[PDB]
A paper describes a structure:
A key function of defensins during innate defense is their ability to permeabilize and disrupt cell membranes.
The structure reveals a near-flat, carpet-like oligomeric complex, which we termed the ‘membrane disruption complex’ (MDC), where a monolayer of NaD1 molecules engages PA molecules on a single side of the complex, thus mimicking the manner in which NaD1 would encounter PA molecules of target membranes. The ten dimers are arranged in a configuration that results in the formation of a mildly curved, carpet-like structure which we refer to as the membrane disruption complex (MDC), with two such 20-mers forming a large 40-meric ellipsoid complex with a total of 28 PA molecules. The MDC comprises three small arcs comprising three or four NaD1 dimers, respectively, in a 3–4–3-dimer configuration. Intriguingly, assembly of the MDC from its constituent 3-dimer and 4-dimer arcs is achieved almost exclusively via hydrophobic interactions where Ile13 and Ile15 from the β1-α1 loop of NaD1 form continuous hydrophobic interfaces along the sides of each arc. In contrast to wild-type NaD1 and NaD1(K36E), the NaD1(R39A) mutant lost the ability to form oligomers with PA, while still maintaining PIP2-mediated oligomerization. Since the MDC exhibits a slight curvature, we speculate that the formation of this complex is likely to induce curvature stress that would be expected to weaken the integrity of the target membrane.
Author numbering:
A (entry chain I), B (entry chain K), C (entry chain L), D (entry chain J), E (entry chain F), F (entry chain E), ...: 0 to 47
């Protein structure tokens, strides 16, 4: 029931809102995505 | 008695006013929603 | 799945290492526990 | 390589050197482990 | 013919983009919806 | 019920007093008319 | 006296001037309302 | 269903963890308490 | 030699960079797209 | 029936009332014309 | 100008400000209390 | 193709309507001209 | 002499410093590039 | 009296506050416990 | 295997997202690249 | 038994071994003394 | 009575707490393990 | 000749002086080793 | 199989070799004695 | 296979040369002896 995390490699530009990062991360065969707090990076998550 | 919390997967845009976040969170099968103070993100809530 | 988060009420002192906060969260009928990055608060996580 | 990350559940104490974190992460069925640069936390990794 | 407008009753929060305001007005049995320039309210429009 | 609003397409000049604007709006098949507060435009109102 | 506060759940748009927010808050069975300083939210107030 | 909110009158110092603020708020005849995110104030909550 | 404008009805989220808004506007059978200045709305353009 | 918009290029002066802008826009082979809210520019509209 | 010092055994949480520690220390039948500078421990004091 | 922009060299005064700014830009051997949304600067455009 | 400017259509990520934006713009057949102040966009420039 | 010390073999994690180390040390049939200054080791003491 | 590290020679500016650093590092005959946490340097990696 | 602590008033010089510090503390109406770890200060102890 | 020591071949990383060093040394068919005071290495001891 | 770096995985304890770390690195098929400045980690180096 | 530790109260001077400190600790009703590493104090040990 | 080490209990005086310490160590049922580099203590070694 762990949540593994890695940075998106297909997300363009600044990560401001969640649905775009979640959509790109799901496209990368992950389950969810969210933005980082400081550098606005789109992080992909999936169970592991 | 204890409120659990997670970020909304469907809420678009910046979380400014509460009602739009509560509506998106209730649609996601939660009991309420609210914005984060700093990053302005829609956080869904439900009893743990 | 979705991960829900809430602050623990039994963890004493500052949260430095994860196992102690994880232990108190499992004691609080949760799945995992981790420390916050700035104020070092013990946060309990579990499926929503 | 692209690596998924999650914090070690079993690693005790401050993460200073890599081998102790790697040892706990491998025991948790992960490929490797490393210390976070700032907060000094043992993060487990596996290919993604 | 002429276009009559009135404030929406189901649109929550601040009117930023048009599709959300336009969708609520159609559910309110109007033909179109647009955001007010200043106060950012959802104005529903239909033929008079 | 709700009040639908549209500008007058027959009122000439500045909208200073109410009776002339109401009189023009009733001729335009509306129930009432009033002046806008800043630009002094004659506005016609009727039930939606 | 001690005043309790909550954000309005009926106020549409951004909060520029006080009277529109005060009106919505009073319809919500509060005694007054005012605009937040930065994000221009409508905050309702009433004695606790 | 409305959560009224006001700052605690008995909580001393800065609000870091929830239990100390919730404890002081219940002693003030409120149902819960939490820390403000930025100013770290202790805010008491009860149904309006 | 004039350009017709309308807001996108398929663009997701906030318009920061141009290429994403141009791509969504082309899918809506326009020729180009650009962001609004403040509210960051994706505006579609095409020859009138 | 999406509405495409462009600024008038024959309207002289400042757009206060709608009839002058609508008449100028129809002479420009558009279906309607309305004033902008702040700068009072005449804006022509027609189906996209 | 001497004070006998011992660590508090009732102070919960992090010791950032003086008031919370001094409050818990007086309840422990001491006269004052202050926080340690690094680990943020509550230290009670009383005249020797 | 791609459109490059630069502020006009000859346009006198504040840029409110488009036709005046378009004339000055064409006189400067550019294609079109438009106003900036904030400082109201006349911006000339031509293919990059 | 006169500097013509457009936004890059190839620059990936946040524009914090100049050299990364300058390198992308030269590949785009421009001569220089700089970052926007607020949203940190890469803007390419070249002589008109 | 004469006081002897030995490192605790049951205290988990980092020794921050005294009560956890004291409780673990008394569990080991000792009389008191405190933390070392630098490495934060839980040291158990008892009459020797 | 183990990963050797060295700072990229061709990476301009600071390292924000991974794909830019990975691309420059691969062109320098390395297998991967990532950003340093604090100084935001592009560090090229290859098996060792 | 709870132990109170303060630095000696009369201990001459740098605290290295225990007996000299204990002697000065017993003279100062305390029960025992010991050296601090870093600055090597003689610290007197007695029950609170 | 007499005791001989040697460096541990199994203990990884820095030697902070005694139990992990004793556990590795017992696994190396020694009777006890402890950390060297300075270089913080795990030393294995057994009857000599 | 560009040099590559990897943290040692056999060096015991903290890294105070170079020779002990350099010796462990050569046994790891590297050419040299040195201590990190703050956390005193043994870092192995060899030509890339 | 657990050694308790206390500083000698009879050994004079600095502790260089083991036999002298060991002898002084035997007279103090202890099993063994050894020097501290840096300050060269005589430490007496006996089973807990 | 492994060299176990302990301090000699028969060597008198300073340890300047190896042969004198080796002779005393061999007399103590050991294989070899050597001087410590700073304190000049005679240390006996033998297979573990
Ligand atoms: C200096 C006092 C304040 C504490 C600094 C803490 C640094 C920190 O939080 O690093 C993480 C942050 C990147 O965040 P993100 O990539 O997860 O969005 O950091 C960065 O992006 C790195 C740059 C940090 C600022 C420059 C170095 C001092
Ligand atoms: C002008 C300074 C005024 C005082 C600032 C101090 C406020 C404060 O305590 O912030 C801590 C907050 C929550 O911390 P934690 O519970 O996650 O450890 O964590 C954060 O604020 C970080 C999360 C937000 C990330 C975006 C920061 C730009
Ligand atoms: C020929 C000169 C034209 C400009 C001078 C008058 C400005 C103006 O048009 O204000 C009125 C207009 C809407 O008013 P109305 O059409 O409802 O009467 O728009 C507004 O109410 C704009 C409000 C401006 C303040 C915004 C910040 C709170
Ligand atoms: C000590 C006096 C107060 C200053 C420190 C407290 C920070 C603070 O009040 O943040 C401002 C703002 C709050 O919005 P509002 O709901 O109060 O209108 O919310 C935000 O900041 C939202 C995030 C974006 C940052 C501001 C952008 C303009
Ligand atoms: C006095 C200096 C002001 C400088 C900025 C001027 C305001 C401005 O240009 O607002 C643009 C925005 C329209 O959104 P957009 O679709 O054009 O991005 O319009 C609005 O958001 C209208 C409501 C603005 C309310 C502001 C309240 C503080
Ligand atoms: C250097 C600072 C300059 C600030 C004033 C900017 C003036 C300006 O361009 O306002 C016009 C803009 C849109 O007007 P319009 O083309 O719809 O008539 O209006 C809007 O976008 C709506 C908001 C206007 C009022 C803003 C009050 C904060
Ligand atoms: C590898 C293990 C890392 C452990 C990290 C935590 C150590 C630490 O914070 O020690 C604090 C201690 C006293 O702190 P306090 O309780 O007075 O706030 O220290 C001092 O007051 C002395 C200052 C530091 C002197 C020694 C430097 C290592
Ligand atoms: C190639 C660089 C382009 C600008 C980079 C980002 C900063 C910015 O937006 O400044 C300009 C902007 C005016 O917008 P516009 O009317 O020029 O489109 O903002 C203002 O008008 C505010 C600043 C100027 C007035 C300051 C008054 C204290
Ligand atoms: C604290 C936040 C201030 C900016 C609010 C709007 C946020 C936003 O998306 O601004 C983008 C826009 C263009 O800036 P840039 O992305 O080109 O650097 O920026 C502007 O046009 C800003 C103009 C501000 C003029 C103010 C004059 C009083
Ligand atoms: C480069 C500086 C080297 C300092 C260490 C050498 C001296 C040493 O180890 O002294 C023993 C001390 C034990 O402290 P404690 O057991 O009383 O908490 O342990 C420490 O003080 C260990 C601190 C080492 C921490 C280094 C960063 C991880
Ligand atoms: C920075 C200016 C010089 C140091 C001033 C003293 C700072 C201070 O109050 O440190 C006290 C603290 C605890 O020492 P002790 O009472 O446990 O021996 O920890 C220490 O004494 C650790 C610091 C030792 C190293 C001093 C600077 C080289
Ligand atoms: C003056 C102390 C704070 C600044 C230390 C120097 C800044 C720095 O390089 O931080 C990163 C550094 C990495 O250690 P190393 O692997 O390079 O030895 O080490 C750390 O991140 C460890 C932080 C040390 C303080 C820990 C809390 C007491
Ligand atoms: C930066 C990390 C390391 C800082 C010092 C850590 C504490 C430390 O090593 O204390 C023990 C040592 C003497 O101990 P001992 O010989 O009495 O057992 O030393 C002292 O008593 C400390 C006195 C200060 C001078 C130490 C010189 C090596
Ligand atoms: C205030 C007292 C300062 C130290 C004075 C005493 C030094 C001392 O006794 O050094 C020898 C001893 C180990 O010696 P030996 O048993 O290997 O011959 O211990 C050491 O080698 C410890 C070296 C000191 C720390 C060096 C920096 C980490």
């Amino acid at each position: 029931a762990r949540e593994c995390k890695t940075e998106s490699n297909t997300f363009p530009g600044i990560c401001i809102t969640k649905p775009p990062c979640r959509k790109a991360c799901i496209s990368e065969k992950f389950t969810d995505g969210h933005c980082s707090k400081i550098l606005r990076r789109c992080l992909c998550t999936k169970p592991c």
